[PDB]
Design a protein around this ligand. Structure first.
Ligand SMILES: *[C@@H]1O[C@H](CO)[C@@H](O[C@@H]2O[C@H](CO)[C@@H](O[C@@H]3O[C@H](CO)[C@@H](O)[C@H](O)[C@@H]3O)[C@H](O)[C@H]2NC(C)=O)[C@H](O)[C@H]1NC(C)=O
Ligand SMILES: *[C@@H]1O[C@H](CO)[C@@H](O[C@@H]2O[C@H](CO)[C@@H](O[C@@H]3O[C@H](CO)[C@@H](O)[C@H](O)[C@@H]3O)[C@H](O)[C@H]2NC(C)=O)[C@H](O)[C@H]1NC(C)=O
Ligand SMILES: CC(=O)N[C@@H]1[C@@H](O)[C@H](O)[C@@H](CO)O[C@H]1O
Ligand SMILES: *[C@@H]1O[C@H](CO)[C@@H](O)[C@H](O)[C@H]1NC(C)=O
Ligand SMILES: *[C@@H]1O[C@H](CO)[C@@H](O)[C@H](O)[C@H]1NC(C)=O
Ligand SMILES: *[C@@H]1O[C@H](CO)[C@@H](O)[C@H](O)[C@H]1NC(C)=O
Ligand SMILES: *[C@@H]1O[C@H](CO)[C@@H](O)[C@H](O)[C@H]1NC(C)=O
Ligand SMILES: [Cl-]
Ligand SMILES: [Cl-]
Ligand SMILES: [Zn+2]
Lengths: 188, 596
């Protein structure tokens, strides 16, 4: 059977980066011609493997991570980054083997009145481990005074929402990212 | 947790929350200036009041972090910016009354109109009525009427409002640990913390006066040359040893002597460099003007204009179907949104202005990576100086010939160059004594050195001595001539125009050295010079993070403003003026008046 790559890339709804979702790919044959011979993506950078030799290759299973970040935050979806997205939202291992694909979605993910659905984690105790996922909305305690559930002075809400608008610069417009992880069923 | 670390996380919350509210307020005022409706004037105020109310909330929240407990100089600058009490240090009624007089002054300045006694049905406001008279008319009485009526009609109304304006502004500055309101304005140049780069608020007064003494010789010869030419235009009205009457200087206040070029042109026979008809014949539109201006910044190493610039800017007048403010402005809404508001016409003056405003955008694009409170020029004079150096290079005949707007066989005589420098001096160096004397008068008023019963008495004593300009008719304390200027009655500092003028020539001389220029400084064009662009970008990226003394040092190599680069620009004209004034009187007597 063909692997459902259209179910992740052409998916209508995409999740926030802090609550990124993962989809496992098991027994199916892949067709990477659709993903590689297309100028629709703005970023198409592979790590540990090449963008062409994958056609004659097999893996135990493929994991597809999908989320939405701003244009300038796409550089952090890469091995060895230390930004806010990489530390508190989505971190890749140093020995990552896969490809990161992103494309601009200004017309569907940014509204004139401000699309505040897409969020990200700004404050967190320590960084996330590789492939870790944190959806906790606990009040972040930045000070010594306890917060007791109510955010106040030195007590900030951990999540802040992206503020995507179609008039933003390209660096602040919404970009949908799909990270394909390779683990050693799926062949070319 | 360290107080420094608690403040850093607080600034993170602020930088993300303020960047969103500032964009809503900026886009709201954009929708008004590009589409003047009542629905947009309230959306501008609603998003504006929300940003103002947000800044006050974060102000008191930021004050709970002791600024002395912070060791990081960068985060220390951000807290100090938020901890400014501003107008809230007043009581609820004094702050409410302050905004009432500030609005009444701004209203009567823009809506005040004077009527002609000879024709009472002819009533004109300042723009374009009275400004057209002061800029074109050659009638002594017509100019004297427009000059006196503007200061006796709308000036006298500002006198009681400006008195209460001074006392209320002093109660704010003295309450914020400042000597006076003048000391508050000088705090923009204040640097305190960096060894070898500090700068006190009082040091500005010392430096502005020290550099002004070196401008006196160039200004005195320009004053003597203009006076000699003005006597031929107004015989039996000007003394060859006295000051120039104020109503004969080219505009309402004598701020710029640009309109005197037709009366003071050195060589009227030589062809004028106006490429206006050239672009009209080559089928140029506003897109070509900005595309060509975009190519200029790319030629020096700076990047292109963003897609949002080409998608969102208003480069033409929408006409009677959509009213819009046509003041050329460069908008930095934040979040990667850079725009330019300009009703561009196919002329040479709009071609040079397009380079000025796009220079502001290149400055805004550079420091966009800095935190929110640090996205601004080094001081109040740095931004205008960057935009001015672009129009200097774009206006040189070498640049116009290379683009195709001037004929390749245009001969650049030594008289065409004196014509250009004389026109530049009437605008550039002619405003320096006016700018300094004006801010000097307000500094003394705020400090309490000029009592109310001699505001206008001391105002014209300084006009005669510093600027060399005498009033045509005597004014008592009923008048308020300084308030008849926009910047005085609209609560704006004015010393920025003096400092930017010395900065722009320090920048030009510094860039032309990196550009390997070899001729006179006024003939320099930094086009195609990637070295000059890299030298300039090293300061644009700093924003307000590094002190202005350090940012200025990164380009010119000096920790303070210098007047020598300004004199080198007008050096060929300065030696020519001394030769012209060999049989004239250089200087003026502070006693002659056209009514003694
Ligand atoms: C004042 O505080 C700021 C921020 O706390 C200090 O600047 C910060 O310096 C660190 C160390 O280099 C920067 O982190 C670096 O990020 C890059 C990104 O790729 C990474 O490769 C490095 O491994 C490192 O993690 C941090 O970005 C930077 N902050 C900013 C806003 O640029 C600054 O040095 C402090 N100044 C003083 C005088 O204490
Ligand atoms: C910076 O360097 C560029 C290098 O291209 C200079 O632009 C070039 O300017 C010359 C005129 O000075 C253009 O020559 C013209 O070529 C056409 C042929 O298409 C010819 O028919 C005309 O009579 C004219 O000679 C040349 O095309 C143009 N370069 C390009 C690529 O179009 C530019 O002037 C330099 N800026 C400076 C020195 O400030
Ligand atoms: C959008 C445009 O080009 N022009 C605007 C219009 O959209 C808006 O509805 C109107 C307010 O009534 O102001 C004007
Ligand atoms: C999504 O739809 C477009 C429609 O043009 C198609 O070209 C593309 O291959 C589709 N993507 C996937 C992953 O099937
Ligand atoms: C602002 O005013 C309040 C009112 O008491 C005062 O406590 C605070 O110190 C002032 N802020 C500064 C920076 O002086
Ligand atoms: C700038 O934009 C022009 C199109 O307007 C393009 O041809 C050129 O390659 C761009 N150059 C840079 C450095 O962005
Ligand atoms: C221009 O130069 C010529 C000789 O090169 C000289 O005779 C003439 O006086 C100069 N004109 C001016 C205005 O200096
Ligand atoms: Cl005046
Ligand atoms: Cl004198
Ligand atoms: Zn400007």
């Amino acid at each position: 059977n063909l692997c459902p790559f259209g179910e992740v890339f052409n998916a209508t709804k995409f999740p926030s980066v802090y609550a990124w979702e993962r989809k496992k790919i098991s027994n199916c044959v892949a067709d990477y011609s659709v993903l590689y011979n297309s100028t629709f993506f703005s970023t198409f950078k592979c790590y540990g493997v090449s963008a062409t030799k994958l056609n004659d290759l097999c893996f135990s299973n493929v994991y597809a991570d999908s989320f939405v970040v701003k244009g300038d935050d796409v550089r952090q979806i890469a091995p060895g980054q230390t930004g806010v997205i990489a530390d508190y939202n989505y971190k890749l291992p140093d020995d990552f083997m896969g490809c990161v694909l992103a494309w601009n979605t200004r017309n569907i993910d940014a509204t004139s009145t401000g699309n505040y659905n897409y969020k990200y984690r700004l404050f967190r105790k320590s960084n996330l481990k590789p492939f870790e996922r944190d959806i906790s909305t606990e009040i972040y305690q930045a000070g010594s005074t306890p917060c007791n559930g109510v955010a106040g002075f030195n007590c900030y809400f951990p999540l802040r929402s992206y503020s995507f608008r179609p008039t933003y610069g390209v660096g602040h417009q919404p970009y949908r990212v799909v990270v394909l992880s390779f683990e050693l069923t799926v062949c070319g | 947790s360290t107080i420094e670390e608690q403040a850093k996380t607080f600034l993170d919350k602020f930088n993300h929350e303020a960047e969103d509210l500032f964009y809503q307020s900026s886009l709201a005022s954009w929708n008004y200036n590009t589409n003047i409706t009542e629905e947009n004037v309230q959306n501008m105020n609603n998003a504006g009041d929300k940003w103002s109310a947000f800044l006050k909330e974060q102000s008191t929240l930021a004050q709970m972090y002791p600024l002395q407990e912070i060791q990081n100089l960068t985060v220390k600058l951000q807290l100090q910016a938020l901890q400014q009490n501003g107008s809230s240090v007043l009581s609820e009624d004094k702050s409410k009354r302050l905004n009432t007089i500030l609005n009444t002054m701004s209203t009567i300045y823009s809506t005040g109109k004077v009527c002609n006694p000879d024709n009472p049905q002819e009533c004109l406001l300042l723009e374009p009525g009275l400004n057209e008279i002061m800029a074109n008319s050659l009638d002594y009485n017509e100019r004297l009427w427009a000059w006196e009526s503007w200061r006796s009609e709308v000036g006298k109304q500002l006198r009681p409002l400006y008195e209460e304006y001074v006392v209320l502004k002093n109660e704010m500055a003295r309450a914020n640990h400042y000597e006076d309101y003048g000391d508050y304005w000088r705090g923009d140049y204040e640097v305190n913390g960096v060894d070898g780069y500090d700068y006190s608020r009082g040091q500005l007064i010392e430096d502005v006066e020290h550099t002004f003494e070196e401008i006196k010789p160039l200004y005195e010869h320009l004053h003597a040359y203009v006076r000699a030419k003005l006597m031929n235009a107004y015989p039996s009205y000007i003394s060859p040893i006295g000051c120039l009457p104020a109503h004969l200087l080219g505009d309402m206040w004598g701020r710029f002597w640009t309109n005197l070029y037709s009366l003071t042109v050195p060589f009227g026979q030589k062809p004028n460099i106006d490429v206006t008809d050239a672009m009209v014949d080559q089928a140029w539109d506003a897109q070509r003007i900005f595309k060509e201006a975009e190519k200029f910044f790319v030629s020096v190493g700076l990047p292109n204009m963003t897609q949002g610039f080409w998608e969102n800017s208003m480069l033409t007048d929408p006409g009677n179907v959509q009213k819009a403010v046509c003041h050329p402005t460069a908008w930095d809404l934040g979040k990667g949104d850079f725009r330019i508001l300009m009703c561009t016409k196919v002329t040479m003056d709009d071609f040079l202005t397009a380079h000025h405003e796009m220079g502001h955008i290149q400055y805004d694009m550079a420091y966009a990576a800095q935190p929110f409170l640090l996205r601004n020029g080094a001081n109040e004079g740095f931004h205008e100086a960057v935009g001015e150096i672009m129009s200097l290079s774009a206006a040189t005949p070498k640049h116009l010939k290379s683009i195709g707007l001037l004929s390749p066989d245009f001969q650049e005589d030594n008289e065409t160059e004196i014509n250009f420098l004389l026109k530049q001096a009437l605008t550039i160096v002619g405003t320096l004594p006016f700018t300094y004397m004006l801010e000097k008068w307000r500094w003394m008023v705020f400090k309490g050195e000029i009592p109310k019963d001699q505001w206008m008495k001391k105002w014209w004593e300084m006009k005669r001595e510093i600027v060399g300009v005498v009033e045509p008719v005597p004014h008592d304390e009923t008048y308020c001539d300084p308030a008849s200027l926009f910047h005085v009655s609209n609560d704006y500092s004015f010393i920025r125009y003096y400092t930017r003028t010395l900065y722009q020539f320090q920048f030009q001389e510094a860039l032309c050295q990196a550009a390997k220029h070899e001729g006179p400084l006024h003939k320099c064009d930094i086009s195609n010079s990637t070295e000059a662009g890299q030298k300039l970008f090293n300061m644009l990226r700093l924003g307000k993070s590094e002190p202005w003394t350090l940012a200025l040092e990164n380009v010119v190599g000096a920790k303070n403003m210098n007047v020598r680069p300004l004199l080198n620009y007008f050096e060929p004209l300065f030696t020519w003026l001394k030769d012209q004034n060999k049989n004239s009187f250089v200087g003026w007597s502070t006693d002659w008046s056209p009514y003694a």
